[PDB]
């Protein structure tokens, strides 16, 4: 149950006396399938080098989120830089419909039946990220009682 996938790979340029020196960037997401999901970025002069240098970053940099069986408990909003993301429980019929790119984090995460959309910029590095913090801020479908009950 390793379960990983990269979301976006891209090229960038540096520009020096001698010209444009190019490179690449991968942005990836790994999840166990039962909460616990992390993304990693990492860049390198060639593609494989970067996509791998990324996968690792994600293995560290890994949060965990209080599911509720196949789904989220309540609806949640996330918002990093220019991405404002929104995802919703959805009493699954099938579910897992969402903006492929946050479909990534969502499936490795283990949620099985949500609807999502991304507003603002669909800049990957900030959606996958906005959603992570999204799922992250989410809270204990019970241990709000922790907060309260008292």
């Amino acid at each position: 149950e390793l379960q990983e996938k990269l979301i976006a790979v891209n090229r960038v340029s540096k520009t020096v006396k001698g010209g444009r020196i190019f490179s690449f960037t991968a942005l990836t997401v790994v999840g166990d399938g039962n909460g616990r999901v992390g993304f990693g970025y990492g860049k390198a002069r060639e593609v494989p080098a970067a996509i791998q240098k990324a996968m690792e970053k994600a293995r560290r940099n890994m949060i965990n989120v209080a599911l509720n069986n196949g789904t989220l408990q309540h609806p949640v909003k996330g918002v990093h830089t220019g991405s404002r993301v929104f995802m919703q429980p959805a009493s699954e019929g099938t579910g897992i419909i969402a903006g492929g790119a946050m479909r990534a984090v969502l499936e490795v995460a283990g949620v099985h039946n949500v609807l999502a959309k991304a507003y603002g910029s669909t800049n990957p590095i900030n959606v996958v990220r906005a959603t992570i913090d999204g799922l992250e801020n989410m809270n204990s479908p019970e241990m709000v009682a922790a907060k309260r009950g008292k």
Binding site: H74, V144, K147, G149
Partner: protein, 129 residues
């Protein structure tokens, strides 16, 4: 200019909280009270207190659980500019159940959980989770 007292509460809380502040005061009113109630009752603050006669003065004790505060989000919903009224079948339910929505009905200031039970509707004062 102090044209919405309830937002001034919702916010004196909200801020004081984010400022890990224990206490919090303000001018009181029947309406302020009835809400402090639901906030205590439903357990988002320790307990309230009104000290004075001429110029009454609501006082609230903030709860903090872990490092965090207990009130993750306090937001007005109705307001002077644009008032809200849901019936019974159209009363909102915050955070899918978790947390709650204050609402004033003809039979006093209750929660959504309550007003649904009470079978009636009112003005949805604010949301709290």
């Amino acid at each position: 200019s102090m044209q919405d007292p309830i937002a001034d509460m919702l916010t004196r809380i909200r801020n004081g909280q984010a400022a890990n502040k224990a206490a919090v005061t303000m001018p009181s009113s029947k309406l302020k009270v009835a809400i402090a109630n639901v906030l205590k009752e439903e357990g988002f603050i320790e307990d309230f207190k009104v000290e004075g006669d001429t110029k009454p003065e609501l006082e609230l004790t903030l709860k903090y659980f872990q490092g965090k505060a207990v009130v993750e989000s306090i937001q007005r919903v109705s307001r002077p500019g644009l008032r809200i009224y849901k019936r019974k079948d159209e009363l909102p339910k915050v955070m899918a159940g978790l947390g709650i929505a204050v609402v004033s009905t003809s039979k006093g200031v209750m929660t959504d959980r309550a007003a649904r039970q009470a079978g009636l509707g009112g003005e949805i004062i604010c949301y709290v989770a």
